[model samples]
Target: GIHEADVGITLFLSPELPGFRGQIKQRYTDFLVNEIDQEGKVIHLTDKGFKMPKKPSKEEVNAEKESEAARRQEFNVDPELRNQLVEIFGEEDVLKIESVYRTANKMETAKDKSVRTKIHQLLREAFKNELESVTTDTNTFKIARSNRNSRTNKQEKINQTRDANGVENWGYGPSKDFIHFTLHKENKDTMEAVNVITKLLRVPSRVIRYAGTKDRRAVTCQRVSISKIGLDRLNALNRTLKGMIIGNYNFSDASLNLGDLKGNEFVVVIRDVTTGNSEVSLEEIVSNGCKSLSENGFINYFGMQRFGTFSISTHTIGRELLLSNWKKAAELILSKEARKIWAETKDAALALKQMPAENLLYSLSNQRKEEDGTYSENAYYTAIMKPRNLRTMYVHAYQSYVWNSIASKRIELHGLKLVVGDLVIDTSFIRAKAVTQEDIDSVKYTMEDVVLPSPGFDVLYPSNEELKQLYVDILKADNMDPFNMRRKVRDFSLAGSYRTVIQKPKSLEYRIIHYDDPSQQLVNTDLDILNNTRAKESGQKYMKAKLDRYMPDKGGEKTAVVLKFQLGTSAYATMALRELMKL
Candidate 1:
């Protein structure tokens, strides 16, 4: 019964810790996030960037598309030569070379074109050398290349990209260059913003790279990078999208990647807080709670967002995958209509037609359809549902759940102290090691840092017999074998990792204020009417009308609180607030 409470994650504060009830993220503006760079500077949330030169007319846009098509047609390589290049240099390297050549064709400057040509020549020579060193036998050639000139050739290509300062200059040419921008978005997730960009540019979604995914319920500003898009086209795109503003455009040789951030700074507002008949006053309770949190720390449980938002558990799909129940996993991922059809009559072909077009299931179903319009169950399960990162996320989410449960239980047992056999994390350097008797004694006074293993085949558990047995027992109870996590499908296999069990807030501060001020108002009357008039005119009329009455009106004195805090990458502000509010 994978309920939230069964994970031992209910509030842990004692009865003496005064209760303060409040609602957070009542509006998108109530929560704000600024990405912190690896250098520990706060990224200011600003919409400023490269100004749009001018909006392109429809004729100009169509002309640009035609020119691009013409350039692509001009940039032709022999198919046999391309295959040989791919076979020798690998797909990624060959792609990079082709991208550079295509970008060179688009460049206006003769100097830029010449530099790109030199780089292409270098790649071609390297590929020729690689081809000569290897045998006709593909596997044998791959093995020989792996042991020999491969490293030197790779370095030669890298060296060709460097300027006088030794900086890798991607320099305005294609080569799948990175376009960095500051994305200012209101109430949209990172993917939503990405989709908008992809639609506007008519580029594939995979070209866009970002450091992290931001919250949908927040007015978030973060750095986003897209690969292989021209500057002029991006400038035009900045003006086309609504509710999203792109600025701070820069070019980089490397694309932004996940976990490429130091942390996030949050400005959150909690409203409707009142003292719950406790001995302490509202102000005092909030003050004490903040201080207590600053001293101790909150459990680093994966927040509710890890599970699907409609209270649908995605981990169930992951569990089914782990148990090798493909039919159930497919059913869970299918659309409502598709699921119903499949439930009524186990005809995968008929059910698949009812599936939404956007889903992977729909694509798989189409592929599985035979000449007779029959579906192959085996093909659907194995080939169609081949291990992919997106599908593996279901399994990873389940692992996250197990980790959260383990962390909560460990806290209950040890209460933040580093016992022998515990794996402790060094906060300053962000490294982890197994605890010894001496290590426990040294940190006994502080006992500030500890880590819990995310259960996988390769993950290390506590050296303590009892603690190790607990993990084994839990997995056995779930009808899962720990060793089975290492599946033949490489993508599905988990190379277990560690996460800190407790995370202390950095630069934590708070202020209590009255809600009646103009800044504190739930909704601006002018903007509400302008933005939500359809709701007001439609079925939401009664709800819209009650907004002012329900909220703290002008001059009405209701206490609200604002919190500012920084958490390391992957730490959840929502979970921290859960510990702060205890509600």
Candidate 2:
């Protein structure tokens, strides 16, 4: 199957904590290992010892003291079970069983919380395993070997050239110069060949790409691209970075750059669904839904629903601020002063040794609105109390992070413009069933097909007039030229080609045609051309710069406007037709 590489493993994690997901490559380990403790306390633990603001409970101490004993007993009773448990719990924490036993022997004189606390932590891990068995939540781990196979025939190539700026460019080039690669096997992480490559190359790490991230423990491969330097270093690096292997080296000159993928492909095999619809045909549902999206686009941005845990990043940012970890807090929240205040308040809340909700509520309630309708300092701090409001605020925070990190780069650095047309999709089978004709007509109405703001607030509630203008223009343009109308307003080069369609009976499909690149042109030239044509047709004054004569003689005359919209890449002119029509 050409798309066989698309199949990914699904791992069902319990208590879908927000900490389970985060910025994939930059901080996977950080998100996974860090968490808020059960006692409503924050703690960081290492293999050597644990650090916390307070002591552990009596039960935790006892558990830790006898963990070693329990481990020894378990091993003696069933080594196979012990090994199986290790595979499930990870090797790092597996020894907790034995540690508890050793701690118990020394409990005769120990009075501190260390022993009990250790036991509690170990028991928590064990409890998690027990829950996994009962719930049977599947966590998909990608097969690493499959990924290596995709690179099997690939060869590393290098490109060296002097640009117009007279600067020499040097980086790892692909074997075929194509930017795509796939995995032939799964769980290549622990492979001896992979490790060998790491040793051989001085590169920080291979920039491996996949449709989605995989468990380091699983075998999975999708697609990846490397720089010229990386390709050159792979062979030599293979010697030391064991387990990792290069299946082959191939090259292509086509600029196979990808901003975002078109969309994801999922092959979910649901087992033991408790709902009555368990026997429902997933394939059929997906096929029909694809037809719908093929006709109409879905919401484009990622919603909170995508992440199992709601506002996970917000929690992290809030926690970091509370702990006075300003730098980390800023990274998480993308606000300097906000991080400081959040950190300060977090400390205050922790000092009370209570959950932060009440205090947060109070803070938000005390806020005062500024005369200009914006939040004052007091109001800004107070708004964190409302759960729904918090979600929206956090989204903005995440958006800010992306703006600074991804959007700040130069156009050339963005590489080839990846025109991801109609990548967004709406998979909801229900359609616009809930919306009324009147609702649809209302400019401020929320369409049933659309995912409304999480906090359920629309800052710029569109007026009827504005909506009429947008609706008329969109429908007219779409009816005239479907392809051009379907184009997205964002710079395609900045977005990914693939988007996840989150409606029921999920499936993946690619958008065809519709995509095109922007050919940056000056506005004046575009406006002049339009005016000239209109002038000849109507036999009126058609001076190149005198466009005021074309102004509409309607209520729109007095409106002060600053258009921030982007046109399709293939659009011949930068000026809007509506503006020219006013003449």
Candidate 3:
């Protein structure tokens, strides 16, 4: 076995196979490789007193290197250049540019810095021009006419049907299509209810669309769109739809044209106040609400409440990359035959050939700019923003591709999408300490320790059900595959937190938004109560209220009204929420 601290570059390329690696099914951190000689024969070597696989033959290694080099020449780009571009635009953008180019060229190389740079430049110019043109035509449709689906014709037909019936056919308007009802309730899971509702309405379950799995415990609402169905069937099943309410109903026009909601509404009720100042009361909260509103309030953003303790989803694309799942990976990144080949085989050479060609068009359109004093900060910001903004889209595209590819091959998998709300304000108090054995022991051994120290956080987390759904939802809504996106985000967040710890910044004692309720508001008086309350009381009051509002309903329990949001195609509601909550 290899010891830790060894460095190795993982490559998924192989000859004779004519494809890239499919979903990687091996450990990236601890991969086993047999050393081979130049003649392609395995050999043994020793390091210290341990025997190691012999290095590959010089000729074989050189041949692979030469092949890679030749492939790069086709794209006229360099590996270093690609890395640099990634640093600027991020891997997702680079890959997206690569995808768009692959649509035109099927045999692009990776080593051609010149071509990549050219493509990068072209993309920048397009964005720049688009922004400039936006000013000239205020009414210019955001999407081109060609980009619009032929929905206009359908809408016109629906109108014609309604007009022909006129006022006389009040109830007989357009044949009631399927009524897609998204249920949200506190305390009860909706899956059973959803299944029941669909069955009762005699509507196909496949017609309903929800953003992601929801909390059985929280009162949650989501958008569900469906086609035409029987009105009587829908109305009859309303009462029997289990722990759910038809939050939104749509007829032909409304059903198909509903936009994503702006945000969620929440009513949290905390109990058993234990403030040192026993005089604190809800009246004070209502009074100070206006004052609190002036300063700031939370917007809608998914809080840590969604993902409770641990156990994250291994996102599909990220898993593919990790497992060297080339077929899946290629399908995620490429389209058509090239993508097919990339998915099925492990031909590094063929992958090499295709990589350059696909990237060539991207390089031409989105060229990398040389670092110079004259580079505009604004322009640099724009370029960086592009990739980060498209992170969710990238995740969605990758996941969709993987799901479709696998399904095509008769391998079934879940293809869930994520929906996120804006940031909601939270006013819960939390205690923190340095990461130490003592800290771990404190939580682990304490009589009332709610959480243990983990690599992620040290707070008391929710049950597995809550956390699992949250992570899954976050994965879908944020368009993040935990394997790729979460790891990157975690690394970035940890770095920032560490920097703060190193500097030993002052602990600012203000009621900022809690992770879960970042969109709501708490008055200054509420903050005072929070600060003065005992830990248990705080949990009982604020935390409990938030949880109650969040959980779905079952039986007599009722789901609370909560708002959600879907940001622009390339924006992050979390980032926006963070700013609003000042997290």
Task: Identify the leading candidate in terms of TM-score.
Answer: 1
On residues 219-302, what C-alpha lDDT tens digit does candidate 2 reach at each position? Answer: 222334444443334433334333223323334453323322332222111111121234443333333334443332222223
Candidate RMSDs in Å, in order, are: 15.5, 32.6, 33.4
TM-score, per-candidate, Cα-based: 0.64, 0.26, 0.27
Native-vs-model 1 lDDT?
0.64
* Top candidate, metric lDDT: 1
Per-residue lDDT of model 3, residues 112-223, tens digit only: 4446345446444432211111112242211121111222222332322222223111234445454544454434554665566667766677665443333443444454
Tally clashing residue pairs in candidate 2. 117
Q: What are the runs in model 1 whose C-alpha is more than 4 Å off?
A: 1-3, 6-8, 11-16, 45-47, 50-179, 194-208, 226-239, 249-255, 309-312, 325-345, 349-390, 425-432, 444-448, 483-485, 490-493, 516-555
Of candidates 2 and 1, the better by lDDT:
1
Residue 346 accuracy (lDDT) in model 1: 53
- Residue runs of model 3 more than 4 Å from their true location after superposition: 1-172, 176-186, 189-192, 210-215, 219-223, 245-250, 254-259, 277-290, 298-302, 305-583
lDDT of 1 by residue, 106-171 (tens): 111111444534434544454343222222333222212211221333533443343323334322
Error of 3 at 287 (Å): 4.9
